[PDB]
């Protein structure tokens, strides 16, 4: 395959001191674990467990994430990314790092986020709230991309919103990575329904624009009230579901452009499909969420060619957000 490079924030990391991105060399500053009282486990992932907790020194509600004793490399990567992004718009705030006595591993403490006030993005929102919260997610993505970081796991479960106060956080930076031009990355990132075509066709030289495809998948599910929008039964069927919408000729042009050697299974299952107009997904019960601006925006995110997709900053300038107070 031919190389690719991000068209924005291309060499951010190249120009930084090595300490910025060389997470393996990072030295952890430890707090005191007994400042935190675990209240209940909220969830369990492949690499962590998350808990509702209280900082008993000040009665503050916090979220604690105990990192499973997997590859230490991944632990330092998440910590370094969270410290580099700390204070950025809508980025979850890492307040402390303590050693859990039971797991014997680092436990990350997050402040200004709690399970009572903030909830995962599982709500059915109005047109205005979709635009408002999508703009808040874009502020987080433009910030992390501008800091040379790709999130690689954008999905509803990684967006926390306090609806009463209209606050949002982009969470779970466990799959995030530093972008370096020319670097090959693992394609086993993101949840199936949110995987970009680059991951499905095994193109490793991807970049920040992967997060923009995932965002487009979220948007399409919200405006069309179809969860998930691209509902593949496995990774092979996931690309067929995308191709039934966007067509196979632009997919094959994308594969041709980057000289991707396609898995032969895809040539057997893809067949030939033409692009559908978005109005094919509009019906009486979602038409109130659809506008010409929403369709144009969706169209500019959901493009096979990762270099052609809107970037997070270009998305912030799009007409879909003109109505959002900024």
Numbering used by the authors: 4 to 329
Q: How did the manuscript describe this experimental structure?
A:
The flexibility of the αD loop in CK2α has been noted before, and presumably this allows the pocket to open and the fragment to bind, forcing the helix from its typical position and creating the new binding site. Indeed, we observed that the loop is significantly more flexible than previously described.
